[PDB]
Amino acid sequence: LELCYRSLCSCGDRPIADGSLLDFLRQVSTFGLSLVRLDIRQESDRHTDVLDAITTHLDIGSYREWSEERRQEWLLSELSGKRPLFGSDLPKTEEIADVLDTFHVIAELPADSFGAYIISMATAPSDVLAVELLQRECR
Amino acid sequence: LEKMASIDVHLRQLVPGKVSEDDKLVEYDALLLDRFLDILQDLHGEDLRETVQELYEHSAEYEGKHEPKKLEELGSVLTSLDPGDSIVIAKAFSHMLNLANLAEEVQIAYRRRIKKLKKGDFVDESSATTESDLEETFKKLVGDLNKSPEEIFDALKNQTVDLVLTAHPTQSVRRSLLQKHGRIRDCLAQLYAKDITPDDKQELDEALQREIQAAFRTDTPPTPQDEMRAGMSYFHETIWKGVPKFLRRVDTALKNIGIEERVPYNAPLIQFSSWMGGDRDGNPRVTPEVTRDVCLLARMMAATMYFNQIEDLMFEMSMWRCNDELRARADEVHANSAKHYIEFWKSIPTTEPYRVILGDVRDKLYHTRERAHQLLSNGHSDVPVEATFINLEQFLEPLELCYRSLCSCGDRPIADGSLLDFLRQVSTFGLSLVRLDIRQESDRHTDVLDAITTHLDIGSYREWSEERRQEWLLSELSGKRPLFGSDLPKTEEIADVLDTFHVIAELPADSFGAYIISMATAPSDVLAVELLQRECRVKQPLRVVPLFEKLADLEAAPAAVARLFSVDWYKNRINGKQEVMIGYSDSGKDAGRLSAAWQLYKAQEELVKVAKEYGVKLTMFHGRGGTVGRGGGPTHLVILSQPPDTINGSLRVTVQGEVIEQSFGEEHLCFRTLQRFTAATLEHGMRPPISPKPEWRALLDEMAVVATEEYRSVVFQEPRFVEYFRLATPELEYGRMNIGSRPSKRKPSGGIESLRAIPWIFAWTQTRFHLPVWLGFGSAIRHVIEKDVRNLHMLQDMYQHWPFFRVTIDLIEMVFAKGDPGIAALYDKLLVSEELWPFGEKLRANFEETKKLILQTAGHKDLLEGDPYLKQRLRLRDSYITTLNVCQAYTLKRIRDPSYHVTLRPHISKEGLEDTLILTMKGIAAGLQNTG
Ligand SMILES: [Cl-]
């Protein structure tokens, strides 16, 4: 489309380009391939539950009992490391499996469909780092 | 056209006596040679035929008296040939030798056995003419060993013989030529039926000429899939039909000692494994895609054979009386959508329930084939996996239901017909016919784990001590965190290793056997493969099999295996079964043959001690070359020779590509092969060879020291040895030549240490010299005879009463039968510098002395004094091989030395010297078969 616009302006046909073509280009830029970008929203408590099942599974303690500073330090050590966090061998409750499966579905779809990951009942930086880490480790 | 009278005279002079009275070998080979030479005259002219026959006559005179004048008489003719005539002559002697092999096979398959020729001891087991068949072994176990028939039957129930097909070190013979050899053998045998009609005999003659010409008039280093296709041909040729016949013979022998059961049709007495498409050791051409390909190709061949076998099964299963269970399943199957038997029946009615169920099995087999084909040629399918058989139980279940129902209705005999054979074929061959072993050097696993730990900022696994490596590997196997992700710098090699693991992970477990670690030395190698397997998401990991090659590796093997059994993780992964591989050719390349033999006996002893300690069932995997690498009757005593309890009802042996045709090409040869493997395993489990006297072990330890000393002093210490090896032998041309499917040197720069075992044996086998096989025996026997006057008597006692020793000596004597120092001297004279010419003279003197000492030990005056049949057949081949030797020598001189101009002779007919060299290599290879 941009090629068509360039060519038409090249030939002194800019007014024609500013007709149906300009409207079309502006519609592609406004609406993209999806019209809308979907935000995902979930309570932070569910991320605490998922990371808690993860750390208990790794025999390191319960992320839930950890202070906010200890949570931040562990999350930061994992985001800066190269080793994956968990595998299929992971006891998932229905809720924990919902969270991870939502991440897998986001992972298998085009980025143009998604906007922001929204953390309900957010209070501390560890909530934001929890979503970033769960995002990265679900590929 | 009286040429036949002369070739008849020369054949009778070469093999004078009759090794029996059904000795028709001279007759057979005379017939094949007459028909071949007439065809040769017709295709390339009278002049070519006269030249060829002059060459063969001189060759037979040489194999008669070994006059060196005869060799120069051959050479004068062979050098004056322009490349065209050289190619036609070399091709001609190749097919002539092949015909001698085919005649030889007919002689072996139809030689009548002699009951009065048995002596009653273990020596009888060294020849097919006197070895024990299945039932003689039964009566040996019942009478002499006082074992009950119940004990024999239960042993058979739990026995497994696992035969492993490996790639040919040269020409893996194409399937078409296998078929042609089959037709030639059939025509020969039928021509000698003592009842044949005149017209049948004429038409048989016309078919024989026709087939010989068909084989003679057919001309990449075949892709691993093509070589695998060629290696699998023996299933169609004889093995598929041969297996149920043999198992049925086992049933008969059991009935004849009072056992009323048959061997359970699901008992895996026979299993087949393949390395074709799985061995990557020094072979970058064997890629992950190659392994996936041969896996799917194998599943395809299997589905085809089951599909074709199941229609005659459907015709036989026309009964109506049945089980309540079978009737229920038949009414169930009748509720569905009949495209693959419209030529037979419009649809299968419910009063033929076995036909209904079996028809549904045939339909699932068809969908199985088409899916495997679709995955092979594309990468995805659309054929639902639930519409096929994915594991052996989905397949066996309805067949077993049919069997149960038929026995329920008093139709057990019908069940023991086409149905029992079918069940036994499913149990033997599975959905793949073969299970693929994967082989890779340990060093590659060190490289992969090293890239992994460096990527995790923990250090280099390579610099870590063995104990630190073990501790880290064990901490990871017991942990729950994954090891690595896509974010991992992979070299081409490291990516190959991981991708191979991913391909294993995405294929059915029925296709795979064992993961084999080349150059294994320590438990960390085994744990490395187990961890890499698990972290690449292989749901059912393969059993890991370490390959201990060098002699020091053999000595350290029982400590490493005991340490492996002692760690809790490996102990729970193996579940009481362990397979260890030892390599005879490889170890011989390291330390000579005599030393590798005695070291492998002791090493198997110690591995058994460990296995009894930890309650693990050990399976010794015997690699290529060695005493365990022979053809026919000798193998029976070979198996009987293994140390007590090293087998224990689970045998795994490499069937070398150079013997596989002699062993499975013909119906009778195949049946007898399966028979002797099963019988020797069964007998050895209940009647081990004698334990060696203490002085025997001390004597072999000293001889082992002297023999490794001589071998390493010649092969590894002599500074000019490598130059001599590159001159007196076609090693350079073998590697450059695109012959061996893989390359020769592991690392291109290195010496013999890096040279693989197959080219090591091959290079010296081509020159009829065989130095890697016998070198070292000479000084060891000289040393013990000189150290004590009586040791010769001890040596002669061992050869007469210790099976391990008898088979080792027997192998050396047999290899000497295929040796001729005169031809080797011709190679020296043409290809080796004058500075280096006396060196071969010294080695040849060693050859002669070693030969005399082996004779002294065996109590023989001539070679193969105890096996005149083999002496006869080998002497027969030698007349053709000698001509390919002289041709190869002068062709080598012509290739290396363009300053050697020859007075050429005019072209002959047909109405590049590299090609001729390849011909001589393949020919001599086919005529000498197995050595070491
Ligand atoms: Cl090898």
Swiss-Prot record, chain A:
The protein's location, in the record's own words, is:
Cytoplasm
| Highest rank taxon of the organism | Eukaryota
As annotated in Swiss-Prot or TrEMBL, what is the tissue specificity of this protein? Expressed in all plant organs, with higher levels in roots.
Its PTM note reads:
Enhanced activity by phosphorylation at pH 7.3 by lowering Km and sensitivity to inhibition by L-malate and L-aspartate, while enhancing activation by glucose 6-phosphate.
What triggers production of this protein?
A: Upon inorganic phosphate (Pi) deprivation.
Q: List the disulfide bonds.
A: none
Subunit structure and binding partners: Homotetramer.
State the family named in the UniProt similarity comment for this chain. Answer: Belongs to the PEPCase type 1 family.
State the protein's purpose. Answer: Through the carboxylation of phosphoenolpyruvate (PEP) it forms oxaloacetate, a four-carbon dicarboxylic acid source for the tricarboxylic acid cycle. Contributes probably to the adaptation to inorganic phosphate (Pi) deprivation.
What name has this protein been given in UniProt? Phosphoenolpyruvate carboxylase 1
Instruction: Please give the organism.
Output: Arabidopsis thaliana
* Shown part of the complete sequence: 412 to 550 of 967
